[PDB]
From a paper:
In November 2021, a variant designated Omicron (BA.1), with over 30 mutations in the Spike protein on the viral surface, was identified in South Africa and quickly became dominant worldwide, due to its increased transmissibility and capacity for immune escape. BA.2.12.1, first identified in New York, became dominant in the US, accounting for about 58% of [name]-[name]-2 isolates as of May 25, 20225. L to Q in BA.2.12.1 introduces some polar character, whilst BA.2.11 is the most radical with L to R introducing a large basic amino acid. Here we evaluate the receptor binding capacity of the BA.2 subvariants, report a crystal structure of BA.2.12.1 [name], and show differential sensitivity of these new variants to serum samples and monoclonal antibodies (mAbs) compared to BA.2, providing insights for future vaccine designs.
To evaluate the possible change in transmissibility of the BA.2 subvariants we performed SPR experiments to analyze their [name] binding to ACE2. The three [name] variants have an affinity of ~3 nM for ACE2, a little higher than that of BA.
Numbering used by the authors:
A (entry chain L): 1 to 213
B (entry chain C): 1 to 124
C (entry chain H): 1 to 133, 136 to 220
D (entry chain E): 333 to 517, 524 to 525
Write the structure that this text describes.
């Protein structure tokens, strides 16, 4: 069996910079049997390059490919806004095989997140469940750590996260985390808090509320 | 319904012995062949020994020619691989393979049935 | 335009069947290598099945024995028959014409397959209000919780409020129901002067809800 | 009686492309087949409908010796019941095939620094070949409803492609020389 490894998993560059994307094959294969694809978020893939270096019909001049044997490379000479997407390489054996893919994101200066905590609504409590939401708004880079503390006890196993795509205007990310408890378990505690650690924060920021206040 | 049960394997010092077995069951006749493949941690899956069951003909690669011995006991329908004078170069995961033909092939893609695979290590 | 038009995706319970279709326009399915490539939520592309123009079929190990690729020449349509569907089969399925040495040049728009035991259920919309305690920017939102299946659509003030709105990807809860939130950051001055209403639409359940979000009063 | 000219087949300087596979009709000669099976440089020696060590004790009307060059990970396609690019569009064996398939790595002969583009294979074909059918047509393959008129373009592709064997490719993409011996009912 052959394996296609793409590195890095995520590439952070500014518009107009030179992007180099690596695609490694576990076995030395001919250059005619490798292709590159592009996939913007929410869209279907499209053929960028076939046969290692041949540019697909309609693909702009700035896209080029090279390599042979085990190491192949897609190069974007000057990134345009529409070029920030996910790129997949694909090798032809007895059947097609895709690499893991490489996301090319927009690099900007570090922006700290704005943290908000939301107690459960009185409407939801009548159902029997309590959802506490923690909002991380407009931060960069994407790596952020949310920690739920209930009565200063670190909570693990009852929270889920969701991150937006990079913003079209400020190129930031936003995160939403939901802590779910039963109404009975929710009433057994007082202080609900989410602590946020991020590169833009010199010390972890904590937003909290006391139940029934 | 062809099932290859392979067992054996372990750790031995340079020069020690080790026997692998592969109980082939489900075949309707004797027209098949057994192959022993091995796979170093980073390398590929290479054949080392073959046995064409219908005509009882063994084949060994040169690096194990005077050291390995492939054989089949017709009673329990099992093919054995007696590995003597083991060297550190023999360290790999060893697989049992079966193909619907009378002969031998170096390609794993030529064999349709496989054993679970077992680790064989030779100490430095 | 040379296209590949896909349909047949839907909701399948684990162990059930589903047949996808891929109607070509601009190329002959009978005369081409044709592929099915899927993409699980948030993961990469995975080749699934291939059919030669000569009839030979090939399948990924993860779908062997369960999937079957086929075509109807008279309808110029490619098909993927999926049996014994599992939860990990949930993905967006694409069909593509394969030129091998020239790559897969034509791609379908995709059709979504969701394997779940959940039944269609409308969401509950709860307000996300700022606790009674307040910088320069305030944040409020709507919690669209416990619905199935995807998707929901959330607008603010009937589409008149778009700047600063973040509608998050939904998360699949352990109950099998989806849940997402939609937030919007406004200047803290306009909390007591501007009314904020989120409009949640869940077409599969005929659920239209308008939720006014207000600061909670003690 | 003289020996069969297997030397001319196995040790030939150049082999044929798989789409234009060569065939050598063998008759009026004696052949030691068990010596062929004991030849270790034969990386593959798979027989169907017959055990290899039994060939020396049988007679047949004619033996056909087909030879060509394919890539490494295509050797598995040279067998009865196989599917894929080679088995379907280049060289197909019947399901009731009686004979042996012989293959060995020929990287030192058929690979070339910079690429050896003389060996070709058919990539585009409308239907599968019949067993033992040799198709050498180079007509532009029509992939859509518009005719090609012998001109390449979109949905109009030349049917053959070169392997471009290089010595630094892996064994899966290195050249392998194949000799298929079919027995028709030489001893
Ligand atoms: C094919 O050739 C094998 C080895 O060839 C040897 O070297 C070449 C250069 C010649 O000098 C040849 O006479 C030598 O034997 C043989 O061992 C083998 O028998 C040959 N194949 C057949 C079918 O005879």
């Amino acid at each position: 069996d052959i394996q296609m490894t793409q590195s890095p998993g995520t590439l952070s560059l500014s518009p107009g910079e030179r992007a180099t994307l690596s695609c490694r094959a576990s076995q030395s294969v001919s250059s005619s049997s490798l292709a590159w694809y592009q996939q913007k978020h929410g869209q279907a893939p499209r053929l960028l390059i076939y046969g290692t270096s041949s540019r697909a019909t309609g693909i702009p001049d700035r896209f080029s490919g090279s390599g042979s044997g085990t190491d192949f490379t897609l190069t974007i000479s000057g990134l345009e806004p529409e070029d920030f997407a996910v790129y997949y390489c694909q090798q032809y054996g007895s059947s097609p095989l895709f690499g893991g893919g490489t996301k090319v994101e927009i690099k900007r200066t570090v922006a700290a997140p704005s943290v908000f905590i939301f107690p459960p609504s009185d409407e939801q409590l009548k159902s029997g469940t309590a959802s506490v939401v923690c909002l991380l708004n407009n931060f960069y880079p994407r790596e952020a750590k949310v920690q739920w503390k209930v009565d200063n006890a670190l909570q693990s196993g009852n929270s889920q996260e969701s991150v937006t795509e990079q913003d079209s205007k400020d190129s930031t990310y936003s995160l939403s985390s939901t802590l779910t408890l039963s109404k009975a378990d929710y009433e057994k505690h007082k202080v609900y808090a989410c602590e946020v650690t991020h590169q833009g924060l010199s010390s972890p920021v904590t937003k909290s509320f006391n139940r029934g206040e | 319904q062809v099932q290859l049960v392979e067992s054996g394997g372990g750790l031995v010092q340079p020069g020690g012995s080790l026997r692998l077995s592969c109980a082939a069951s489900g075949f309707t006749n004797d027209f098949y062949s057994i192959a022993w493949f091995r796979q170093a941690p980073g390398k590929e899956r290479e054949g080392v020994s073959w046995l064409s069951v219908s005509d009882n003909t063994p084949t060994y690669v040169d690096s194990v020619k005077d050291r390995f011995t492939i054989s089949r006991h017709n009673a329990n329908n099992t093919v054995y691989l007696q590995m003597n004078m083991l060297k550190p170069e023999d360290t790999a995961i060893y697989y049992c393979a079966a193909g619907r033909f009378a002969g031998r092939d170096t390609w794993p893609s030529s064999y349709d049935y496989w054993g679970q695979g077992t680790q064989v290590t030779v100490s430095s | 335009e040379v296209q590949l038009l896909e349909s047949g995706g839907g909701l399948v319970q684990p162990g059930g069947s589903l047949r996808l279709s891929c109607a070509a326009s601009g190329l002959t399915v009978r005369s081409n290598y044709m592929n099915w490539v899927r993409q699980a939520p948030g993961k990469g592309l995975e080749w699934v099945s291939l059919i030669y123009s000569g009839g030979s079929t090939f399948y990924a190990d993860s779908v062997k024995g369960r999937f079957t690729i086929s075509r109807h020449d008279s309808k110029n349509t490619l098909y993927l028959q999926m049996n014994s569907l599992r939860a990990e089969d949930t993905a967006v399925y694409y069909c593509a014409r394969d030129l091998v040495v020239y790559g897969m040049d034509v791609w379908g728009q995709g059709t979504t397959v969701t394997v779940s035991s959940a039944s269609t259920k409308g969401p509950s919309v709860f307000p996300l209000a700022p606790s009674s305690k307040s910088g320069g920017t305030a944040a409020l939102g709507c919690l669209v919780k416990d619905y199935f299946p995807e998707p929901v659509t959330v607008s603010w003030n009937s589409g008149a409020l778009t700047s600063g709105v973040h509608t998050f990807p939904a998360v699949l809860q352990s109950s099998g129901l989806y849940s997402l939130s939609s937030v919007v950051t406004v200047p803290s001055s306009s909390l007591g002067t501007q009314t904020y209403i989120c409009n949640v639409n869940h077409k599969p359940s005929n659920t239209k809800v308008d939720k006014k979000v207000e600061p909670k009063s003690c | 009686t003289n020996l069969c000219p297997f030397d001319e087949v196995f040790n030939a300087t150049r082999f044929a492309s798989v789409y234009a596979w060569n065939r050598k009709r063998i008759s009026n000669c004696v052949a030691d087949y068990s010596v062929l099976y004991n030849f270790a440089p034969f990386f593959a020696f798979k027989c169907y409908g017959v055990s290899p060590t039994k060939l020396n004790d049988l007679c047949f009307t004619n033996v056909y010796a087909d030879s060509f060059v394919i890539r490494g990970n295509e050797v598995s396609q040279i067998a009865p019941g196989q599917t894929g690019n080679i088995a379907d569009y280049n060289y197909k064996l019947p399901d009731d095939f009686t004979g042996c398939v012989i293959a060995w790595n020929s990287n030192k002969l058929d690979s070339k620094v910079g690429g050896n583009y003389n060996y070709q294979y058919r990539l585009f074909r409308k239907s599968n070949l019949k067993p033992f059918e040799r198709d050498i047509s180079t007509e532009i393959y029509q992939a859509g409803n518009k005719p090609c008129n012998g001109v390449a373009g979109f949905n109009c592709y030349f049917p053959l492609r070169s392997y471009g064997f290089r010595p630094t490719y892996g064994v899966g993409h290195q050249p392998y020389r194949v000799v298929v011996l079919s027995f028709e009912l030489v001893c």
